[PDB]
Design a protein around this ligand. Structure first.
Ligand SMILES: CCCCCCCCC(=O)OC[C@H](CO)OC(=O)CCC
Ligand SMILES: CCCCCCCCC(=O)OC[C@H](CO)OC(=O)CCC
Ligand SMILES: [K+]
Ligand SMILES: [K+]
Ligand SMILES: [K+]
Ligand SMILES: [K+]
Ligand SMILES: [K+]
Ligand SMILES: [K+]
Lengths: 106, 219, 101, 101, 106
């Protein structure tokens, strides 16, 4: 089964700065990667689907890129509401799997 | 409206079994799958299994031990997950999620906190927290409410039934002698209190008890 | 409207049905098999089309017994339908050629 | 029962036979060639089906001379059989179209 | 030819505990991996076929997982009768090959 590696586990950035979370798949999965946000005590929230497609209701500040084995979730000018845990998930091969998670810290 | 509704908590004794539910609303299609994801405190998301209601077939994560059995009810639009012969390793939040058969989880339930303990259910005692008579005040004042003596987790604390979100901090619970305790904090402009009410709402799903506690000045 | 033409249209409607049912059942058959890729519906319908026309690039294909049985029904339904059209074009041409004589 | 229809059914029974004998002989031909994948019977029968219908995803294929010769017989038997059915559907349509006139 | 690597060669666990044996293939072999048990002086015994399929007559305690190049044989709550050598074998490409073996120790 496809192993998704998110590194670093913790990312520290300064307000308004640009940040990038990384997700690497153990094998090639085209663009079948999805990103989720989960704030403290909250339930996960879909941010980007198929690696780079926008979701309605999500600030334009969020964007995704990559194809193959290497994926990036980016945030233009991070702000307080972005403090959370971020997960990638793949749907290319059965079974679906999640990455271990990156924590954003400001 | 909330698309997936799940109970807030379930207490289970080691060796016993429980059946979690997930009631779905909104658009429903023949190509929908309902997934279950397990998350232990301080840890990540772990996929458990999935079921396609329209047909009744379920698949499970092979990398882990099978504690789950999934079923669905077409008429009541509800998906169920039967966890059996539980142990402390099985204590975690269990979320259900919906996938339109295209690979991503468009929407998630709020999750059911499951606790596997021999302990007993116990509602929380909610006490006020108003400044002491000698406490000087600035342009803002801080009030709070203490919630203790409860089990199992969790409890949800809101201020003025939600209308008061900004300026709120609810600390994580602490476990001591099979009972949890936590406090929530709220900060409003000093000139607005107590002229304008400030009540803390504390809900404890595991005992089906919700109580309010207005915060007024001492003596 | 002649028989050959009806059988053709009928073959086409049945093909579209086999494609949609094939897409649905392939996902149903394949989820549960570690490594399977024929597991979300939009790509399965595309897989169903390239199987029915026998192009078979692959980019996707079934790895389980039931997904393969489903693949064979799609193949046979597409080959039969395209063949029915060919045979209908033959009946048409033969009929009109006997008039030009 | 007309000839075209008999030749068709006969083509179908022969196809099923070529598929089972093809599966057996491909494994026989391929075991012994380092790297070969067409080496257990259930997947070889599936390989035989997708070759006969000419879909050719691929997921499996022969690497030895005899497995390839076996592949060509399967291809030709499938193309001939599906072609015989098409031609039988033509004979049927042409006959009934001469009655509607 | 496909090289199957089993590591560690020796695994020590406490009674009733959960154990996992690992088998890594030098290239991708779908789920064409099979597991065997061989007790001291005994002949090999099939435990799991095609990576995760049950065999009749084998305690439910045994389970397999993985696809691709990484495979796991697991034992829920190990007991004395499980003390033995464990081998994986692949049938994806000719010729069939075996892994070097993992010894279970309690
Ligand atoms: C003649 C038959 C052609 C079939 C083409 C299938 C394309 C699948 C696809 O990539 O579709 C991608 C999109 C999402 O980007 O899925 C959808 O919601 C579209 C519904 C088909
Ligand atoms: C119309 C022709 C369809 C051929 C489909 C072949 C599927 C092979 C397979 O995966 O079969 C898998 C199973 C084992 O899981 O093998 C068996 O014991 C089944 C006997 C065919
Ligand atoms: K072709
Ligand atoms: K082809
Ligand atoms: K092809
Ligand atoms: K191909
Ligand atoms: K190919
Ligand atoms: K043709």
């Amino acid at each position: 089964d496809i192993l998704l590696t998110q590194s670093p586990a913790i990312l520290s950035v300064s307000p308004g700065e640009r940040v990038s979370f990384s997700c690497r798949a153990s094998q090639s999965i085209g663009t079948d990667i999805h990103w989720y946000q989960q704030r403290t005590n909250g339930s996960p929230r879909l941010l980007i689907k198929y690696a780079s497609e926008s979701i309605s209701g999500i600030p334009s500040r969020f964007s995704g890129s990559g194809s193959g084995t290497d994926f990036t979730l980016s945030i233009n000018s991070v702000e307080s509401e972005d403090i959370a845990n971020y997960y990638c998930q793949q749907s290319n091969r059965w079974p679906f799997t999640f990455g271990s998670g990156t924590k954003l810290e400001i | 409206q909330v698309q997936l509704q799940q109970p807030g908590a379930e207490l289970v004794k080691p060796g016993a079994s429980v059946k979690l539910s997930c009631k779905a609303s909104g658009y429903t299609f023949t190509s929908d799958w309902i997934h279950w994801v397990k998350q232990r405190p301080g840890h990540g998301l772990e996929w458990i299994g999935e079921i396609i209601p329209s047909y009744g077939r379920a698949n499970y994560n092979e990398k882990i031990q099978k504690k789950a059995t999934l079923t669905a009810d077409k008429s009541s639009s509800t998906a169920f997950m039967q966890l059996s012969s539980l142990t402390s390793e099985d204590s975690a939040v269990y979320y259900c999620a919906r996938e339109r058969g295209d690979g991503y989880f468009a929407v998630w339930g709020a999750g059911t906190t499951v606790t596997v303990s021999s302990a007993k259910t116990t509602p929380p005692s909610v006490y006020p927290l108003a400044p002491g008579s000698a406490a000087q005040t600035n342009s803002m004042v801080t009030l709070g409410c203490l919630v203790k003596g409860y089990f199992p987790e969790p409890v949800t604390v809101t201020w003025n039934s939600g209308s008061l979100s900004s300026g709120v901090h609810t600390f994580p619970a602490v476990l001591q002698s099979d009972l949890y305790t936590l406090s929530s904090s709220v900060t409003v402009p000093s000139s607005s209190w107590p002229s304008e009410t400030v009540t803390c709402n504390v809900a404890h799903p595991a005992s089906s008890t919700k109580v309010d506690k207005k915060i007024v000045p001492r003596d | 409207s002649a028989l050959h033409w009806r059988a053709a249209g009928a073959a086409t409607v049945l093909l579209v049905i086999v494609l949609l049912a094939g897409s649905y059942l392939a996902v149903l058959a394949e989820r549960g098999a570690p490594g399977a890729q024929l597991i979300t519906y939009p790509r399965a319908l595309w897989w169903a089309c390239e199987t029915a026309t026998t192009v078979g690039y692959x980019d996707l294909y079934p790895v389980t017994l039931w997904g393969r049985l489903v693949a064979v029904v799609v193949m046979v339904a597409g080959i039969t339908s395209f063949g029915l059209v060919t045979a209908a074009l033959a009946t048409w041409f033969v009929g009109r050629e006997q008039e030009r004589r």
